[PDB]
Amino acid sequence: LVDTTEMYLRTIYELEEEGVTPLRARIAERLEQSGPTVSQTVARMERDGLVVVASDRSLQMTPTGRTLATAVMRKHRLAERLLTDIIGLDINKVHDEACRWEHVMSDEVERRLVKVLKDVSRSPFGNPIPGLDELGVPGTRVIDAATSMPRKVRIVQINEIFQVETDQFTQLLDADIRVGSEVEIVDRHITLSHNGKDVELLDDLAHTIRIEEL
């Protein structure tokens, strides 16, 4: 369930955000894991293309690693908003609770939260919620888305242109368808448707276309 890689990744993002250089000792401390352990985990994250240890001994997240981190931070902060706004959990406990929820929330649940919550621009602790765009807010495709169933759606775208073829365209136209538208678608081929118608477608367309869603 809890992927430890996601834990390291959101910790680099967090430090980076506070304007701190994400060096291994700071990460070991915040994570409360010995230097040797973080050293081995970073070695396998490099092999996975998630991070690179920069010329200056700091950790630079690769495009893919940054994308993973962002989604974890978005889940974390959407969870905090849900916990304070709707649930009424004591503010002194919101953060630690969200630290666990961030690992099990599906994107489908996030899409729904953006709808039921009135304001998803910042966390209760004053930091902006990242990656809402990646959520349609090219894508986606358707294829993827578608579934079967149917559905429806738307567408856105377609483309056409591319284509080739055409044829268808026309067819577508016729139917118508376209773108826106719505449608439806578925697957079954695928287808678508428307018107009715249907357509278917092819493939291419378917693939492409785308668507877204619604």
Instruction: Out of 18, 32, 56, 108, name the contact with a second copy by CB under 8 A.
Output: 108
**Which window, 9-17, 21-29, 92-100, 118-126, contacts a second copy (CB under 8 A)?**
92-100
- How big is the CA angle at 74 (ends 68 and 77), to the nearest 5 degrees? 140
The least distance separating a second copy from the CB of residue 103, rounded to whole angstroms, comes to 7
**Which window, 43-51, 52-60, 95-103, 125-133, contacts a second copy (CB under 8 A)?**
95-103
Q: Longest Cα pair distance anywhere in the chain, in angstroms?
A: 64
30 binds Co ion (CB under 5 A): no
54 binds a second copy (CB under 8 A): no
**Which window, 27-35, 51-59, 96-104, 122-130, contacts a second copy (CB under 8 A)?**
96-104
User: Which is nearer to Co ion, 61 or 98 (by Cβ)?
Assistant: 98
Q: Give how far Cα 167 sits from Cα of 113, 119, 174, 201, Å.
A: 41, 45, 12, 11
Instruction: Out of 25, 43, 54, 104, name the contact with a second copy by CB under 8 A.
Output: 104
Burial class (CB in 10 A: 0-12, 13-18, 19+), 85: middle
Do the beta carbons of residue 54 and residue 60 sit within 8 Å? yes
| Residue 75 phi, psi (nearest 5) | -60, -50
103 binds Co ion (CB under 5 A): no
13: closest CA among 100, 139, 128? 128
User: Which is nearer to Co ion, 1 or 36 (by Cβ)?
Assistant: 1
- Give the pair of three-digit tokens for residue 175: 């139917």
Do the beta carbons of residue 12 and residue 68 sit within 8 Å? no
56 binds a second copy (CB under 8 A): no
119 binds a second copy (CB under 8 A): no
Q: In the complex, which residues of this chain contact a second copy (CB under 8 A)? A: 1-2, 83, 86-90, 93, 97, 100-101, 103-104, 106, 108-109, 112-113, 115-116
